[PDB]
Amino acid sequence: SYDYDLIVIGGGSAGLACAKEAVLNGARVACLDFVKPTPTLGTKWGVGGTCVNVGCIPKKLMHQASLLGEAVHEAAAYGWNVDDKIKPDWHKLVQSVQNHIKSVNWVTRVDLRDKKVEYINGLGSFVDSHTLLAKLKSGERTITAQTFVIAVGGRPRYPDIPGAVEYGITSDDLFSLDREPGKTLVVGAGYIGLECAGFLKGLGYEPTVMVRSIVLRGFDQQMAELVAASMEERGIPFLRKTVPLSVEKQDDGKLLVKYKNVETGEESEDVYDTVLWAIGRKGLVDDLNLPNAGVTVQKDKIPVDSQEATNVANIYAVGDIIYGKPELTPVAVLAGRLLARRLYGGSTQRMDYKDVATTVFTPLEYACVGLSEEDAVKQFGADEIEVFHGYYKPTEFFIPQKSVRYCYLKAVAERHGDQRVYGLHYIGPVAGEVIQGFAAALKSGLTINTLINTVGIHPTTAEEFTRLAITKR
Amino acid sequence: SYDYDLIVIGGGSAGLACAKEAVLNGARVACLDFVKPTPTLGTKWGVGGTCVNVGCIPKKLMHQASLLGEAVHEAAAYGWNVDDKIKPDWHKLVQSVQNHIKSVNWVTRVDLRDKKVEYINGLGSFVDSHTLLAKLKSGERTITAQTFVIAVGGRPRYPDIPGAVEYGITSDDLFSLDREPGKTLVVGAGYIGLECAGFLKGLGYEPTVMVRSIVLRGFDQQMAELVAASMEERGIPFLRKTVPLSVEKQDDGKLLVKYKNVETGEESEDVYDTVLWAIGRKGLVDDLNLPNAGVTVQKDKIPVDSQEATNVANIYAVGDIIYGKPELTPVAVLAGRLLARRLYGGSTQRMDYKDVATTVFTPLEYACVGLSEEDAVKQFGADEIEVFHGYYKPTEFFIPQKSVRYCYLKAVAERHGDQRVYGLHYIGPVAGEVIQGFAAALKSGLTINTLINTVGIHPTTAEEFTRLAITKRSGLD
Amino acid sequence: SYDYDLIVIGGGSAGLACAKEAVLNGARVACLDFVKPTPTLGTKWGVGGTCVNVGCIPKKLMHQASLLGEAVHEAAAYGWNVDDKIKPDWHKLVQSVQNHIKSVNWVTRVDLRDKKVEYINGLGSFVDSHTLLAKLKSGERTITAQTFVIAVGGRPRYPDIPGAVEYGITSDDLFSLDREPGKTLVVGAGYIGLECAGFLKGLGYEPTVMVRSIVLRGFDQQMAELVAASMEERGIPFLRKTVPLSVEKQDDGKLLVKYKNVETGEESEDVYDTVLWAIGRKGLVDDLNLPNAGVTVQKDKIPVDSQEATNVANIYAVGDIIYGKPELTPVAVLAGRLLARRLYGGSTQRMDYKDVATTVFTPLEYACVGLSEEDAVKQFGADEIEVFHGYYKPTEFFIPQKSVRYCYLKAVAERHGDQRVYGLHYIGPVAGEVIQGFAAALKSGLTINTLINTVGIHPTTAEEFTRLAITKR
Amino acid sequence: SYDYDLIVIGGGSAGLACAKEAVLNGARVACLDFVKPTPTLGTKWGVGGTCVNVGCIPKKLMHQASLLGEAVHEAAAYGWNVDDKIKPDWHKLVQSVQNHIKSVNWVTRVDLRDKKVEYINGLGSFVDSHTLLAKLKSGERTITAQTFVIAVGGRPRYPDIPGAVEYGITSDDLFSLDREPGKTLVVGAGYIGLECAGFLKGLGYEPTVMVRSIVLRGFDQQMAELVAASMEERGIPFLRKTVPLSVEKQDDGKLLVKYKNVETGEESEDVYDTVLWAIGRKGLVDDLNLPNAGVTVQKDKIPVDSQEATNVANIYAVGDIIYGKPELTPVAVLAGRLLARRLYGGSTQRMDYKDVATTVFTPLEYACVGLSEEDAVKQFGADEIEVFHGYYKPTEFFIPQKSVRYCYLKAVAERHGDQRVYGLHYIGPVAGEVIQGFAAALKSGLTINTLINTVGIHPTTAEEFTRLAITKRSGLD
C-alpha cells in the first residue's frame, strides 16, 4: 500500500487532464508541478503548463491584438471616421494578457483543490519505480505510488553560441516582457518563430526571421513558402540559409548579432533590441532521474506503446514528452484523459493520433489536416494522387483592397476509385475555424465526391473547399 | 427547328449557372434577365440576380462594416490608443458597396460574352410552350426553343396596408439608400429582417424589430430565441405579436406607423425615419403568363419533381421560384448546373436538397446544418434523440469583456445504435466558417463518436464541437 | 503712327505666345504684365502668368512629390530594403519648387529681352481704343497702339463670407506657403480643389473636400464620382452638399469653420490649420476700364468672334478671359500664336477649340477628350449611343496590391454606321500620357472599328482602349 | 468523322486566343501545351505561353522594380527623409514575380476549363495531315482533326560554342534565377538583351552588353544608338563588334568568357558570375515532324499566306512561328482570334500586320509605330520625306536633376500633299503609354496638320508630339 494510487509528474495540459479524470474514477492522486524560472530574466508562472501560461493562450491574444490594429485600418475603408494612426501600449497589452493568465491560474489551483487532486508544487525525480522525491521550496518529501504518469513536457532550446543565454530570450520571456521588443531578431521559422514575428510586426515592432534551412519543417512546403512570402509581403525581412554565430551587448544597450550564410559562408552582422530564440523545444527528461526507475528514453523524449506505457509496467508517459507524436494541447488533454480511463475507469479506448488538425496563427493564418502533398505523393505515387487547388478572394477584402496574393487552398486526394481525401490546406482568415469541421469530415471518410457536392455556405471563405475544380494535373 | 435549344428565363444564381453549364455541354442558349425598378425610389441594378446586387453580398458587406466598428472598440481594450468614439459615413459606405457590386456586374458581363451565353436584357413571358415574347427597350422579339428553364426568383413583399408602397422600403432599396436610415422600423423577423436590424444598430442607427408571430420561422426555436435575446442585449427592441396597420408622413417628414398587438388587440404608434418591410419574398410567376404554356403553379411558386420538371415536359424550373426548397444562392447554383448536365450532358445526378447548411449573419452569427431539435424529435421521437450542448467562451472575448451569454452550441443526434448526427447548431463569431466543414462531415455520415474523438484545433471556437460532453437528458452520464 | 503696332495686356500663356509670334512677324510690340499680390499674405511672383507661377507647374511638382512617397512604399513590396516610414520636409519641397519657378522667370524675362518684346512691368487700363495707361511701381507712362490683344486671365475667387480673406488662402498662396498646411479644409470640388486635396493627403497632411453641389462640374459625372470615391478610398473626407458660413481664428491659432448642409439646413463646425478656397476663378475685366475703349463684356469675361476680335475692330482677346472656351495653357498658347499670325503673318488659320483633351491630376489621375456620356446621349439620343467600358488592372499594381477599385475606362461612340468615337475617359496611372495620342486620333476621325483593330502595346494600361468589348447596352 | 474540328498545337498567346474563339464559334477543339524544361537548371512553368511565364510579364515587373529604385532616389530630392542607400532582396523579388505569374496561370486554367477548350498537357507531333501524336506523362494519345492550327512559338538560342549550355543561361532561366545574377555578361543587343541589361543594372548588378554587329536590328538606327548611349550614361558598358568564343568555370566558381573583336581579330577575356545568351529565338518546328503532314518550312519558321494557311489547305500557323511577321503578344492574340473567326465564324477579316506599335522597356524606354526614318527614305526617297524632331524635358526630371540628354522624339512624314505621318518615335518615360494612342491615330490616317493642331495636355511628355515645329531639313521654315 503506497501513499497514492497515481502520481502525475507535471501539471500541464496532459498531467492535469489525467489527474482530474483519475480522481473522477476513484483513484487517490497527487500531481506535481514546478516551473523552473527562465535563465537570466527569472520569468516564472503558475500551475497549468505551457499552453495557458506561455503558449497557445498568450500567443492567440497577441495575434488578436495585431489583427485588431489591421481591423481599425479596414474600418476606415468601410466608411468609419476612425483615426487609424494608432500605436499599442505594450505594457498595457502585457498587463491585460497576464491578468487573464494569473486569474486562470488561481481558478485552476482552486479547481484542483475542489476535485481532490493533491497539488504539490515541487520538482519530482525518481528514487525507485515506485518512489518519487519531491523538492518543494520549503523542503523535500519522498512519496510513493502504485503507478506513475510522466507528463513533463519540454522547454525552449538555446543555441550553443556565445551570448545566447545572457542576451537572448525565448517564448517563455516574450509574453511578459517588461520592455518593448523593438527591433527583434527571430531565429527559427517553425510555427512559434513565425507567429511571434507576425504579431510583433502587427504591433508596430520590427522583426526579422532567420531561417537555418527550411520554413515550417514538417508542413507542406508549397504552403510553408506561401506563408513565408505573405510575411515578406507584410514587410518582415527573412534571412534565408543563415545561422547565428554570437550575440554581444554594445555600449548602446543594443545587441550585436553576428551570423553566417550556411551555403556561401558569407558572414554578416546587425544590431537588434531583442533576440528571440525559437529553434525548438527540448523534452524535460533530465531532472526525472529516469535510470532510477529503469525507464528507457530516446534523446529528450520517452518512447511509449499504443497504451502510453513505457518499458516499465507501472510507468506511463503522455503529452509532448512522448516520442514521435504531435506536440499540441488538445492531443495532450485527450491522451491524458483516455489514459486515466484505461487505468481507473476500465476503458480500452486508445488515443487516436492520426490526422490531427493544426493551425499556424501567422498574420494570414495557415491551417491543415492530413497529408502534405509531398507526403501523399511519396506514399501513394504521383499517378494515384490528384490535387485540387485555387486562389480565392474573401468577400470582405475587396473594399479595403486587402491582399489576396496568398489566399490559396488545396485538397490532396486519391486520384481514382473512392477518391478519398488525404489532406486539406488553407491559408487565409480564421483558418482554424475553417479547417476544424473538415478534420471531422476526414475522420468520417470524406471523399472528393462528397466534398464537392456539399452545398456551400455563402458568402464565406470555407465554402471555397466545396467548389474546388482545378486540378494540378 | 427552334431558335435555341434552351432559353433560360432569369439571369440570377440559378439561371446563369444553368445557362453557362448548358453551353459547356453543347446547347445553343439564350438567357433573359431584366430588373424591374423598385416602386417608389425606382432603385435598379445590373446583371447577376439578387445575391450580387441586393442580397448576400451587400448584406455581408454591411455586416462587416458593423463588425469593424466593434473591432475598433475592442482594439482599445487590447492597449491600442484608438479614439473609440466613431460614426460611419453612410454615403461613403454605400458607394463602396456599390463599387464592389458594379465590379462583379462587369465580370459577369465578361463571363457571359466569353462563354457563348446570349444575354437578352428583356422581360420574358410565354406565348406557348415553345415560344417566348421578350420585351426589350429597343423593341420586342418573339423567340423559340426546344426547352425552357424558368429561373425568375422573387421580389420583396409589401403589406396590404395604407402607405406601404409610398412610404416604406424593402431590402432592394436599403443597400443603396440615398440618405441615412436613422430610426428604423424593421417589420419581419426572418433572417433578412434580423440581419438588417443587426447591422443598422451596429452602424449607429436605431432599429426596432416588429414580430407578427415567431422569430426565424423554419429554424430551431431554441436557437431563434437565443438570437433574439442576443439582439435585445445589443439594444435592439422587439415588438412581439405585433402587426403594422398604416404608415403616414408627418409635417416634420417623419413616418408615423400605427400598429396592433395581435393578442390584446391594443393599438399604438411610433414615429420613424425609415420603415423597412422584410415580411417575405413573392415568386415572380405573374409576368410569365404561365397559363399560355400550360404550366401549373402553387401560389407564387412553381412545383417541380426531383428532376426540376414542371407538369410540362420541356419546361423546367430552378432556384427560389420552385416550391418548398431552400432559397439560397449555392442551392440555386448547384441545382442549375446539375439541371443543365441532365439536359445536355447525359447526367442522371439529381440535386441533393437535404441537410443544406445556412448562416444568419446577425450581430452574433447563427449557423446550422441538418435538423432542428424539434424536427428531430418529431421525426424519431424524443426517446430516440440525444442532444449534446454547452456554452463556451471565445478567447478573443476575454480582454474586451465581451458578453458570452449567448455563445451556445448543440449537436442533435441518434440516441442509440451508431449515434448518427442529425443536426448541428452554433451561435457565435464566424458561424458560417465554423459550420461549413461540419456540413461536409454530416454528408460523410458523421457520428457522435467520430465527432467527439476528432481532435480540436486550439484555441478556436470551432473546437467546441469536438468536446460536447454534456447531454440535455443525462448530462455527463 | 502709334508707339507700337501691338500692345499685349497680360504676360502669361496667351499674352507671351502672341507677343513673341507678333515680333517674329515683324511687328513692334510691348507686353504689359503685373501681378497683384495676394490679399493678406502678399504672395507675388514673376512674369509668365498663372501656369508657370501658381498653376500647372507647381501643381504637377507637388503631385509628383506625393506619387514619389507612394513609390517608396511600393519599392518595399518589390523587394527593396527601403525603410518606408517617411515624411516630407514641406519647406525643402517648397524651396525646390520655387527655385525652379524663379529660375524659369529669369530665363523668360531674358528671353523676352532677346526677342525684342518690350516687357513693361505695369498694370494696363484703357484710356481710348488706341491708348493705354500703364501704372509701373516708379510712375505712369501712357502708350499707344494700332491694335490691342487682351490676355489678362483671372484670379482665385473668395466666398462672400466672414473671415474668408483674412484667414483663408487660395492656390496663389498654397504653392509657396511659409508653414505646413496641416489639417486643411479644401472648399471646392473642381480640378484645382481635388488636385490640391490629393497631393496634400499624399504629403501626410489631412485635407477635407467640401462640395456645394457636384464634383467636377462640367465633366462626365460617372467619372467624377469614381474620382471622388477613389479619393475617399485614400482617406480624404468629403463633406457633401455643404457650404461654408464663416471662418474665425481661435486663441489656439486654429481656424474654426462653421458650415451648413444645403439640403437639410443642418449646421456644423470643425477646426482646421488651413482653409483653401478653390471655388472658381474670376476674369480680370475690372482693372482694364473696358468702357473707355468701348469693349463689350459678359460678366468677368470678354465675348469674341471666331477670330478672337471683340466688338471693337482693333481690339482682340485671347486665353482664359474669353467667354465660353476651355481655360487651359496649351489652348491659350496656340490661340495667342495663331492670332499673331493672322494679324502679322498673313495667315487665316483660326483656333480649333473642339475636343480639347484634359487631365485632372488627382492621386489616381483622370483624363478625357471629347463628349461625356451624358452630353453624347443628350445630343444624339440614347438609341444612337454605344458605350464600351471596363475595369482593368495595371500590371504593376498586383505585387503591392495597389487598389484597382477605380481603374476604369470607357469609350462613348455612335452606335451604328461609321461608329465614330465621341469621347474617351480613363482613370488610372499617367492618364494624360494615355489620352494624348487618342485625342489626336479623335481629330483624325477615330472610329470604334479602327480603335479595336489597333494592335495594343503590351504590357501597358493604354492598350486597354484597344480591347474594349463590353457595352453598357 | 475526326475526333475534333480543330486541334491547336501550342497553348500560348496565339494558340489560346485561337482555341477560345473557335469554341465560341461552335468548333469542338483541343489545345495542346507542353513546356520543355531548360537544359541545365531544368526551369519549367505553367500554362499560357512565353509572355506570361518568361516574357513580357516578368520582364515588365523587373523593369518596374528597377524604376522603383530610381523613384526612391528621386523622392529624396523632393524633400522626403528617405534613406536613399538601398539594395533589393533578389529572392523576395523573384518569389513575388512568381506569385504574380502563378496567379495568372491559375486564372488561365479556369478560363480554359470554363470555355470548353480541352487542354492536353502533352507534346504534339504530326502522324499525317489529319492525325497528331500527343505525348503525355500519363501515356500517349493519337488524335484526329479536320483542321490544325500550329501555334508553337520559339525558344531562346544558344551560341555554338564550348560551355554555352553547361554554364550559360537564357531569359527562360533569368526570371526565376535561384541566386543573384551578380556581374553579368549579356550577349545580344536586341530588345530582350537590352531590357535585361537595363533592369540588372537598376537592381545593383553589373551587366555588360556584347554586340555582334548592330544594336536593335530592325529598329530606327538613330533611335537605337540613342538608347545605347542612354544605357552607357547609366554605367552599362558595351563591347562593340564582339562575339563570344567559349565559357569555362574557374576554381573560384566564376565564369571565364573568352571573346573576339570581329574587326581587329583581337581576343580577350573577362570573368562573370552569370552569362546570359540573348542572341535570338528559334522556332519550335523540329518536334512537330512537319514532313509527316507535308508542311513546308523556311528555317525554323513556317511561311503562311494572308489567311495564315500553310501549303497544306487544312493546316494553318499563327504567332511567332510564322515567317517574317512581328513577334509580339497582342499580334499573336489578334491573329489567333481572327483566324478562328475565318475558320468557324464566317469572317473574311484578315490580320493587319502593318504599323504595329512596340516598346523597348530599357531604363529610358523607347516606343515607336510605323516606319523608321531609313525605311521611309528607302520607300519614298529622301526628297519625299520630312522629319519633325526635338529634345524635351519631363517636368518630373527638374528637381532630381535627372538627365534629359536622351529625351528625344521624331515624326517621319510625307513631305508634300497631305503630309501623312509614316512613323513616330519616342525615347523617354512611359513610352508605351505615350505611343499607344498615336498608333490608333496612324491607323485613322493621321497627318502632320492634324497632329500639330491637336491641343497638348499640359504638363505631360506626350504633348511634345503635338508641338513638333522643327524639321531636320528646314528647321522652323
Ligand SMILES: Cc1cc2nc3c(=O)[nH]c(=O)nc-3n(C[C@H](O)[C@H](O)[C@H](O)COP(=O)(O)OP(=O)(O)OC[C@H]3O[C@@H](n4cnc5c(N)ncnc54)[C@H](O)[C@@H]3O)c2cc1C
Ligand atoms: C437581402 C437578402 C439576403 C440574402 N442573403 C443570402 C445569403 O447570405 N446566403 C445565401 O445563400 N442566399 C442569400 N439570399 C438568397 C439568394 O439571394 C437567393 O436564393 C438567390 O438569389 C436565388 O437565385 P435565383 O436564380 O433563384 O433568383 P434571382 O437571383 O432573384 O434571379 C432572378 C433574375 O431573374 C429576373 N427576372 C424575373 N422575371 C423575369 C422575366 N420574366 N424576364 C426576364 N428576367 C426576369 C430577376 O429580375 C432576377 O434578376 C439573400 C436574399 C436576400 C434578398
Ligand SMILES: Cc1cc2nc3c(=O)[nH]c(=O)nc-3n(C[C@H](O)[C@H](O)[C@H](O)COP(=O)(O)OP(=O)(O)OC[C@H]3O[C@@H](n4cnc5c(N)ncnc54)[C@H](O)[C@@H]3O)c2cc1C
Ligand atoms: C523575354 C521576352 C520578353 C518579351 N516581351 C514582350 C513584350 O514586352 N511585349 C510583347 O508584345 N511581346 C513580348 N515578348 C514576345 C511574346 O512573348 C511572344 O510574341 C508571344 O509569346 C508569342 O506567342 P505564341 O503563341 O506565338 O508563342 P508562345 O507564347 O511561345 O506559346 C507557344 C506554346 O506552345 C508550346 N509548344 C511548342 N511546341 C509544342 C508542341 N509540339 N506540343 C505542345 N506544345 C508545344 C510552348 O512550350 C509554348 O507554351 C517577349 C518575349 C520574350 C521571350
